[PDB]
Design a protein around this nucleic acid. Structure first.
Ligand SMILES: [Mg+2]
Ligand SMILES: [Mg+2]
Ligand code: NA
Ligand code: NA
Lengths: 257, 250
DNA sequence: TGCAG
């Protein structure tokens, strides 16, 4: 098939923890997010730390998307699906029994470019000290990826809060599942998604750089595998209010679907 | 000595075993450290009756008149009192509140605050609401005041993060001083045997938040230590919490 | 008034 039919069949996603818990300039920052969505027109958006006012705003502005949320109050995750590109089939939420932070796993099954996709997001248990709970949640996520319908491509994207050796400590990713940043070459340029030296939204006594935001991919077991195409960190511009959209950078990523 | 000093301590007044001896222990610490300000939580009337009898160098403010409550003690020779107030927590189920005393310390205004935020792991909702109030008050305190909040926050991992973090200009003293491991945990069931429990739990419930005045150069914490981790004659610790001693460069 | 690594 020709170049343009191929470029049109490519899936695009954005994953972003929007820091809805930071009340400062929140309306301006939601406007910022919307400007990025208009720029990148992603097929799927995976969001974390939404709060009701924020998602209400998005639903009023981003009317070309269908919305699903991980909760109706507090703070929660969301999946947005571009209606002209992605056909919604069904959704569900899987609970994390031992979370103290209302965390869970939000799943949407869809059709895209003639293929079934299983789209997942979570905001895994926060803070270094919560390595144990986070790890448990990671296991659930990975199990759900392994077990997804054999004919589906699985894409999890979210704020994993994972740090050094936590994945290695569960034996690494299972066969058939890759971390997209790893698969694209472990590039330093687009590695850290939370960087308190570079991002001035929070004042912090000690700076750190972490790769909290991650994308895991599993191809269909019954079809040829798909590769990621390209990834970039986004949101590294300040808004008119003099702050960034979030204390995280977003990930923009395409796949050769 | 130009350095301001404070002690903050949840005295566990709800534990009545050896309470008199334990209040004596606390008084021994006050006599040694002679802090300018003492922030206390979980006082009960008997306990405070004792302290007021003994610590005559201090002016007392109490957060309630019965049940259990907080207190602020001011060293009369070092601190001049201006005014006090209590901010209520409308949805507390445990009579928690925010006790505030405004004072001057060699001419510099201090806005002193204490609270015992809603207790128990599962009360994170109410606790976080209360934390919001506290932080907002710290934010709104008079520009010419140094603000010191010290108290039993009952705070967990991410509860501060899940509120948006501390506001600009406001620091956690333990963090500011380098997250030193030896003055980290203030409630430690392994190291403290006052509570009979089977499990090990180690938490940083007791915290100090600091904001400078704009009318003066930034205040930095200088030295912090945990106190009370030695048994009294009665064979028990002063409290199930360790106390915090802290000095400031003003 | 149930950790952290
Ligand atoms: Mg956050
Ligand atoms: Mg207690
Ligand atoms: Na490609
Ligand atoms: Na000192």
């Amino acid at each position: 098939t020709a170049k343009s039919e191929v470029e049109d069949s490519k899936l695009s996603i954005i994953s972003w923890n929007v820091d809805g818990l930071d009340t400062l300039n929140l309306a301006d920052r939601a406007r910022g997010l919307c400007s990025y969505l208009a720029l990148y027109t992603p097929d799927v958006v995976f969001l974390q730390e939404l709060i009701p006012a924020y998602v209400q705003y998005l639903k009023k502005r981003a009317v070309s998307y269908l919305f699903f949320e991980g909760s109706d109050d507090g703070y929660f995750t969301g999946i947005m699906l571009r209606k002209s590109r992605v056909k919604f089939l069904e959704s569900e939420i899987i609970c994390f029994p031992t979370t103290q932070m209302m965390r869970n796993l939000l799943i949407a099954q869809v059709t895209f470019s003639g293929q079934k996709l299983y789209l997942m997001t979570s905001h895994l248990e926060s803070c270094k000290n919560q390595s144990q709970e986070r790890t448990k949640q990671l296991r659930v996520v990975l199990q759900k990826i392994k077990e997804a319908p054999e004919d589906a491509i699985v894409i999890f994207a979210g704020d994993t809060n994972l740090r050094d050796a936590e994945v290695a400590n569960v034996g690494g990713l299972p066969a058939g599942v890759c971390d997209v940043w790893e698969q694209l070459g472990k590039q330093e340029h687009c590695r850290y998604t939370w960087d308190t030296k570079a991002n001035s939204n929070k004042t912090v006594p000690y700076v750190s750089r972490c790769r909290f935001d991650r994308i895991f991919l599993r191809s269909a077991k019954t079809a040829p595998p798909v590769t990621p195409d390209h990834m970039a960190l986004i949101g590294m511009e300040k808004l008119d209010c003099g702050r960034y959209t979030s204390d995280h950078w977003g990930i923009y990523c395409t796949f050769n679907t």
